[PDB]
Amino acid sequence: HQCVKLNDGHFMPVLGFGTYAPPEVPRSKALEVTKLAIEAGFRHIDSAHLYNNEEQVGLAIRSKIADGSVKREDIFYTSKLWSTFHRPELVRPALENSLKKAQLDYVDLYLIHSPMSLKPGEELSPTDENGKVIFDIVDLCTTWEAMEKCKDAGLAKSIGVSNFNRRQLEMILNKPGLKYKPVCNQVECHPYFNRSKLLDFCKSKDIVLVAYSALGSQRDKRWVDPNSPVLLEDPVLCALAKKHKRTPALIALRYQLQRGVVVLAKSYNEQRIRQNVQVFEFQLTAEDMKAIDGLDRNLHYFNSDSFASHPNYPYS
Numbered sequence: 001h002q003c004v005k006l007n008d009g010h011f012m013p014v015l016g017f018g019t020y021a022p023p024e025v026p027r028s029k030a031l032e033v034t035k036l037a038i039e040a041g042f043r044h045i046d047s048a049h050l051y052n053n054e055e056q057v058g059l060a061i062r063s064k065i066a067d068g069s070v071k072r073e074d075i076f077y078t079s080k081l082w083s084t085f086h087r088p089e090l091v092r093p094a095l096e097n098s099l100k101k102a103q104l105d106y107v108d109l110y111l112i113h114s115p116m117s118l119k120p121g122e123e124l125s126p127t128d129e130n131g132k133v134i135f136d137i138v139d140l141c142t143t144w145e146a147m148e149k150c151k152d153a154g155l156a157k158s159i160g161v162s163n164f165n166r167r168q169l170e171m172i173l174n175k176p177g178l179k180y181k182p183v184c185n186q187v188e189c190h191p192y193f194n195r196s197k198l199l200d201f202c203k204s205k206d207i208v209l210v211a212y213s214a215l216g217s218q219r220d221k222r223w224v225d226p227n228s229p230v231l232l233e234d235p236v237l238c239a240l241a242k243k244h245k246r247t248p249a250l251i252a253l254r255y256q257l258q259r260g261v262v263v264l265a266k267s268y269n270e271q272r273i274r275q276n277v278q279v280f281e282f283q284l285t286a287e288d289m290k291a292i293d294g295l296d297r298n299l300h301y302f303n304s305d306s307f308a309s310h311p312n313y314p315y316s
């Protein structure tokens with residue numbers, strides 16, 4: 001039930017529910033499982049305009065609020081500005097549109113989803129006559145300024161970023177007249193890509209690293225190489241799981257918590273959802289932690305093939 005204090009004074013629960021499902025998963029499932037996650041103890045819910053599920057996620061919270069299970073102030077709710085909305089004048093309207101879909105007065109946290117700005121307009125993934133995604137050039141410091149206006153108007157209690165590397169964080173950090181540092185940076189983080197260098201950097205700046213694909217990602221065929229290793233079949237995680245008689249997933253989650261990383265976990269399965277809350281019931285030894293440290297293989301599960309050429313692609 002622990003939270004971590006953010007550098008603007010707000011608190012964030014260290015365990016979060018990921019809500020993204022691919023589009024073939026029907027939208028009514030996001031409503032169901034967000035309800036199950038709250039019943040199970042999740043209070044930190046991660047969504048995004050890209051996910052096409054914020055209305056369902058908002059309806060889940062409203063329902064659990066109306067049945068007396070939680071109050072609005074107990075729920076930590078996250079959304080993200082998609083990359084077609086980086087131009088500063090589009091940021092407050094994008095946030096306001098998310099608030100209307102979810103039917104909430106504020107978000108607990110608003111993020112820049114990705115630093116790879118994209119052609120503004122209505123399509124989430126605008127593409128040219130030759131199938132290429134269409135980039136756009138935007139000064140992210142102006143985007144950030146508009147983010148800061150959103151906190152001031154109280155529509156976002158906290159603001160942060162996602163998928164930034166060190167050079168992009170410093171750019172916000174070294175901004176003349178910077179009012180609010182980012183509270184966090186949400187990045188792909190798991191034993192095969194542990195981001196120890198970035199984590200050390202964010203720790204020195206009082207910026208929380210938040211892990212996604214902490215369980216090795218959904219291995220979606222649009223993005224993930226089928227030949228890539230399966231995180232949860234890893235013999236060291238499996239050996240550790242038997243020792244504590246937990247599960248591999250639970251080893252992977254506990255690893256992030258003990259190194260001070262806030263960890264997300266997606267599951268659309270009732271039983272696995274309730275299992276993940278058990279991450280608070282045990283602890284790994286310092287030597288288990290070193291063993292997991294040695295799995296790092298610089299492996300990004302997400303294959304960028306029209307994105308590697310983006311000037312702001314963060315694995316450059």
Ligand SMILES: NC(=O)c1ccc[n+]([C@@H]2O[C@H](COP(=O)([O-])OP(=O)(O)OC[C@H]3O[C@@H](n4cnc5c(N)ncnc54)[C@H](OP(=O)(O)O)[C@@H]3O)[C@@H](O)[C@H]2O)c1
Pocket residue numbers: 017018019020021046047113162163186187211212213214215216217218232247249250264265266267268269272273275276
């Ligand atoms: N900011 C970004 O760019 C970004 C990028 C990616 C993701 N995210 C967010 O963070 C979340 C990241 O997670 P992810 O979507 O990449 O998937 P993930 O958390 O890495 O999970 C991958 C798979 O593990 C399964 N799983 C969950 N619990 C399990 C358990 N106890 N035992 C065995 N398997 C289990 C799930 O399958 P089942 O559903 O069948 O249980 C899930 O599909 C996303 O949902 C999204 O909210 C953000």
Ligand SMILES: O=C(O)C1(c2ccc(-c3cc(Cl)cc(Cl)c3)c(F)c2)CC1
Pocket residue numbers: 020048050113114115116163302303304307313314
């Ligand atoms: O859950 C998410 O946020 C998704 C996602 C997954 C990955 C990315 C992403 C991938 C690469 Cl290779 C690079 C960057 Cl900056 C973001 C992204 F922008 C969005 C699956 C929709």
